[PDB]
């Protein structure tokens, strides 16, 4: 149909376009590379072609698909690995003998090879149905049906034909819909453009616990179900590490991992590691992976795949939420997504803003976060779901004022830090309290108090300790440890202990084991207890030396507690933590008189 | 101390020779591998001139060399520079070319083939023709040496698979 007028860089101009929508997907040239229409100048439409071009001729054919860059939502997304332009990566390996994308491959959006078992819904013939309703379900996992087959949004009618229970393939018809005669047939998959968010019934308040399973978050600033999060940091920050832990431990029923332009070895590691390791609520065959789907993309792999990653992933997440699942979406990193834009603004010749990144940055990040939150699912059964977004970014040389980090921080309500100095001693991730806040902290403590722990009371003293520690440390540096008071010495020690035992997730035998809110609470009871009794003791006359040497064993025990597997009496209160409480009491008394 | 440095020094001179023997062998081999390829290539352009110098056998080949170039050319007029022996052969088949071009295009038939009074060398070109632009900007060298040489780029891995594979 159209004919290539020019290729200047990855940017292609082709005449004989009478139309085309925004960001319309095309297959360009005989090669059949990915593209999207960004703009139209005259009859000539400028289309960026984002798969590497080293050999596209002028006057090669241009085929419009007729709809924007879109995603399929349907059966077999779980335990199936995809790119950001929704090509199954497994399908490519077999055919192509190119494990990664080579230049010029056209592989359909889903797997049309794997038959799936369809069972019929509470909607039988003659019944009205509307988008996001559970028309049926597909068995995908050993424990649960993952993919609840939804009628798509922006479709409606009464069902003339319901296919019976049995096996069918993806392209075969299984549903016929009545509304102005045959409105159309439906297939197992449905399509949606990824620049349109999916519509919900209502959004609902975020105040319900999100257990990410990592001690350091639970202790300092927990997230919420419905959360939005920013995390900075630059290599040796433990972001890959916290993703793997996050996937294993996560209470959410789906986790969607987004690789924005990753090392490739990093993607190779996490893929291998989900079936090698076991889940905490049990998992039969590829345990963790059963709950994990990967969108993975490397650093030179298509600029479209990388740009679309956050939208392909957020659309997936919204679909699981409309299904009635709790989703934890990890994107890593939005900063690598931001580089895809920096590149897009130069090529096109549009004028950018500061740091050579465009101004449209701020809108695009904001749109992604607002589609997240906790909501009541669209569809007649009605369920509760969430999309809680944890989004990684990277500072430009210790500069946190770079447009990407500042923008994400603008939109977020939770900020979790990352300190370079503390990572060097091996404490990554490294969250303090002067580089981090959470608005959810206040409601979240109220909900944890209820469940069992004393957390809110301990949280306040814990915050104070860290806040004083920093200030007191500046005096040690400059003046020396000769200007201190004895209570201030106490604040320094307890603090050093907190730094190691929560923030560090680095091994010494084994990478640290699942620590819940309950575990995390016990650690806090022992550190806070140490501090109170010791200050009383010094106030009331007593040696510093006597008190520190005496705590001794108790300190070794809390350090290593996290390596030991949870439950050692109970999850709730361990016998190992219970006993220390007595030891402090016995010491306090010896010291006083 | 200085023993150890004279002890290394002689073991260094020992491995400069192991290395130079090993380099003279890849050099003798590589230059022998090429001497053979440049005698294969040599025989082909000698064989080809004998084909070129029997005019009636060269006649359909030349027609095809031109039609080929003309489709990369895409002008209604081509200037053909030829040898003083091939101008007579081109002349006696201009209509056939313009026919043959027309049937292999959908652009328009070729209007004219221009026999110019400037010619290619005969002590620098063995035979063949240079088909060129209307103002002589871009040219498709369909000479025997040039075809053989570009062909060499792709001939080399093929020749390598049948000869050492």
């Amino acid at each position: 149909y159209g004919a290539i007028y020019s290729v200047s860089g990855p940017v292609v101009i082709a005449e004989n376009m009478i139309g085309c929508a925004m960001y319309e997907l095309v297959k360009v040239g005989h090669d059949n590379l990915v593209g999207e229409v960004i703009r139209i100048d005259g009859d000539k439409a400028t289309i960026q072609v984002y798969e590497e071009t080293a050999g596209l001729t002028v006057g090669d054919p241009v085929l419009r698909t007729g709809k924007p860059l879109s995603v399929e939502l349907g059966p077999g997304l779980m335990e199936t690995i995809y790119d950001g332009i929704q090509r199954p990566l497994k399908a490519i390996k077999e055919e192509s003998q190119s494990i990664y994308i080579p230049r010029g491959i056209d592989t359909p959006a889903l797997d049309r090879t794997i038959k799936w078992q369809f069972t019929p819904g509470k909607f039988q013939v003659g019944d009205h149905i509307s988008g996001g309703d559970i028309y049926g379900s597909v068995f995908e996992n050993s424990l649960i049906s993952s993919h609840k087959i939804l009628l798509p949004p922006r479709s409606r009618g009464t069902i003339t034909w319901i296919a019976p229970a049995g096996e069918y393939t993806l392209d075969e018809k299984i549903l016929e819909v009545e509304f102005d005669g045959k409105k159309s047939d439906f297939t197992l998959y449905h399509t949606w453009p990824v620049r349109v968010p999916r519509p919900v019934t209502e959004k609902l308040s975020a105040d319900y616990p999100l257990l990410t399973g990592q001690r350091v978050l639970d202790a300092l600033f927990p997230c919420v179900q419905g959360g939005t999060t920013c995390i900075p940091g630059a290599f040796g920050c433990g972001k890959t590490v916290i993703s793997q832990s996050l996937s294993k431990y996560s209470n959410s029923d789906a986790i969607i991992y987004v690789g924005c332009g990753e090392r490739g070895n990093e993607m190779a590691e996490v893929l291998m590691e989900f079936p090698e390791l076991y889940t905490e609520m049990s998992g039969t065959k590829e345990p963790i992976m059963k709950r994990t789907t990967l969108v993975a993309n490397t650093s030179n792999m298509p600029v479209a795949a990388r740009e679309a990653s956050i939208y392909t992933g957020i659309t997936l997440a919204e679909y699981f939420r409309d299904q009635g699942k709790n989703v934890s979406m990890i994107a890593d990193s939005s900063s690598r997504w931001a580089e895809a834009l920096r590149e897009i603004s130069g090529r096109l010749g549009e004028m950018p803003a500061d740091q050579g990144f465009p101004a449209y940055l701020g809108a695009k990040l904001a749109s992604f976060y607002e589609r997240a939150g906790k909501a009541v699912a669209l569809g007649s059964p009605d369920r509760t779901g969430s999309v809680s977004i944890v989004a990684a970014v990277s500072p430009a040389g210790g500069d946190f004022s770079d447009p990407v980090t500042t923008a994400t921080l603008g939109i977020t309500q939770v900020f979790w830090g990352l300190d370079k100095k503390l990572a060097q001693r091996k404490h990554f991730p490294s969250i303090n309290t002067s580089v981090s806040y959470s608005k959810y902290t206040n409601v979240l403590n109220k909900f944890y108090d209820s469940n069992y722990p004393e957390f809110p009371v301990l949280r306040d003293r814990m915050k104070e300790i860290l806040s004083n520690a920093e200030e007191l440390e500046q005096v040690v540096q400059l003046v020396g440890k000769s200007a201190l008071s004895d209570s201030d010495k106490i604040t320094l020690d307890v603090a050093t202990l907190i730094k190691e035992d929560f923030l560090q997730q680095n091994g010494y035998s084994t990478y640290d084991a699942f620590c819940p809110i309950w575990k995390t609470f016990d650690m806090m009871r022992a550190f806070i207890s140490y501090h109170d009794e010791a200050q009383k003791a010094v106030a009331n006359g007593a040696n510093w030396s006597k008190l520190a040497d005496s705590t001794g064993d108790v300190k070794h025990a809390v350090s290593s507690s996290k390596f030991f597997e949870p439950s050692r009496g109970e999850k709730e209160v361990h016998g190992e933590f219970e006993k220390l409480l007595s030891t402090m009491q016995e010491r306090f008394a010896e010291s006083t008189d | 101390g200085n023993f150890k440095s004279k002890l290394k020094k002689a073991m260094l001179s020992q491995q400069i020779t192991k290395s130079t023997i090993a380099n003279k062998m890849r050099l003798k081999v590589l230059s022998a591998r090429e001497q053979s390829l440049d005698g294969i290539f040599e025989e082909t352009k000698e064989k080809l001139s004998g084909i070129a110098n029997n005019r009636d056998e060269y006649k359909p080949i030349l027609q095809s060399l031109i039609v080929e170039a003309l489709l990369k050319l895409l002008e209604p007029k081509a200037i053909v520079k030829a040898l003083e022996r091939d101008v007579d052969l081109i002349e006696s088949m201009k209509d056939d070319i313009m026919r043959e071009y027309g049937e292999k295009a959908q652009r328009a038939p070729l209007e004219e083939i221009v026999i110019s009074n400037d010619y290619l060398n005969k002590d620098l070109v063995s035979g063949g023709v240079v088909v060129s632009n209307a103002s002589d900007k871009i040219e498709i060298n369909n000479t025997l040496e040039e075809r053989l040489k570009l062909l060499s780029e792709e001939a080399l891995p093929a020749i390598r698979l049948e000869l050492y594979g």
């Binding site: - | 002689a10 001179s13 020992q14 020779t17 130079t20 023997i21 003279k24 062998m25 003798k28 081999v29 022998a32 591998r33 053979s36 005698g39 294969i40 290539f41 025989e43 082909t44 064989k47 080809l48 084909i51 080949i61 095809s64 060399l65 039609v67 080929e68 025997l144 075809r147 053989l148 062909l151 001939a155 093929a158 020749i159 049948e162 000869l163």
Partner: protein, 49 residues
Amino acid sequence: EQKNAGGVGELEKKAEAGVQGELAEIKKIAEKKKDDVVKILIETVIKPS
């Protein structure tokens, strides 16, 4: 050093003996497949490429 005054003699003896047989087979295997490749080369040229 004597392994380096007598190693200059060996500088050519082991370089020559190293491919003495290989240069005879390269020139041997060429004279066979010479004709066979030349027909392919002629063919590619008198075929419009």
